[PDB]
Paper text:
For the RRM1-D169G/DNA complex, the final refined model contained four RRM1 polypeptide chains (chain A to D) and four single-stranded DNA per asymmetric unit. The overall structure of RRM1-D169G mutant is similar to that of wild-type RRM1, nevertheless, a small local difference was observed in the β turn (Turn6) containing the D169G mutation. However in the D169G mutant, the β turn (Turn6) connecting the β4 and β5 strands, which contains the D169G mutation, shifted slightly due to the loss of the hydrogen bond between D169 and T115. The largest shift in the β turn is located around the mutation site G169 (chain A) whose Cα atom was shifted by 0.8 Å as compared to that of D169 of wild-type RRM1 (chain A). The β turn in all the four RRM1-D169G structures in the asymmetric unit has a similar shift of 1.0 Å (G169, Cα atom) on average as compared to wild-type RRM1 (D169, Cα atom), suggesting that this shift is inherent for the D169G mutant. We found that the D169G mutation consistently enhanced thermal stability in all TDP-43 constructs examined, with a larger melting point increase of 7–8 °C for the smaller RRM1 and N-RRM1 proteins and a smaller increase of 2–3 °C for the larger N-RRM12 and N-RRM12-G proteins. The crystal structure and MD simulations further reveal that the higher stability of D169G compared to wild-type TDP-43 is due to a local conformational change in the β turn region containing the D169G mutation and a reinforcement of the hydrophobic interactions in the core of RRM1. Here, we provide biochemical, structural, simulation, and cellular data to show that compared to wild-type TDP-43, the ALS-linked D169G mutation in TDP-43 generates a more stable protein that is cleaved by caspase 3 more efficiently, producing increased levels of TDP-35, but not TDP-25. Since the stabilization effect resulting from the D169G mutation is more pronounced in smaller protein constructs such as RRM1 (+7.6 °C) than larger constructs such as N-RRM12 (+2.0 °C), the smaller TDP-35 could be stabilized more than the full-length TDP-43 by the D169G mutation and hence, the TDP-43 D169G mutant is more susceptible to caspase 3 digestion.
One example is TDP-43, which binds RNA and DNA and functions in mRNA splicing, translation regulation and transport. However, when misfolded, TDP-43 aggregates and forms the major component in the ubiquitylated inclusions in the neuronal cells of patients with amyotrophic lateral sclerosis (ALS) and frontotemporal lobar degeneration (FTLD). TDP-43 consists of an N-terminal domain (NTD) and two tandem RNA recognition motifs, RRM1 and RRM2, followed by a C-terminal glycine-rich region (G). It forms homodimers and the two RNA-recognition motifs are involved in nucleic acid binding.
Author numbering: 103 to 180
The structure:
DNA sequence: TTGAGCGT
């Protein structure tokens, strides 16, 4: 139901790469990685929106290895 | 090049 955030994301990692990973847990609507609009390099974190609530907690209920680094899905601070 | 945090 809510937009999740992911911390610890490697720098080279991209949006497509996440879809590959989170699409293993369930219905992914969108993903957006945060970058500098001058370089396009990733801040090391992004967001992710699922369709089902089951798949969201499952993801928020654990840590995730991504690009060779562990990342934690948390509830944000809109 | 970098590694806690929180979305043009």
């Amino acid at each position: 139901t809510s937009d999740l955030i992911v911390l610890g994301l490697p720098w080279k990692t991209t949006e497509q790469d996440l879809k590959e990973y989170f699409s293993t847990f369930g219905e992914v609507l969108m993903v957006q990685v945060k970058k500098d609009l001058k370089t396009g390099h990733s801040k090391g974190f992004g967001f992710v929106r699922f369709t089902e609530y089951e798949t969201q907690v499952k993801v928020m209920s654990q840590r995730h290895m991504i690009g060779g680094r562990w990342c934690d899905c948390k509830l944000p601070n809109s």
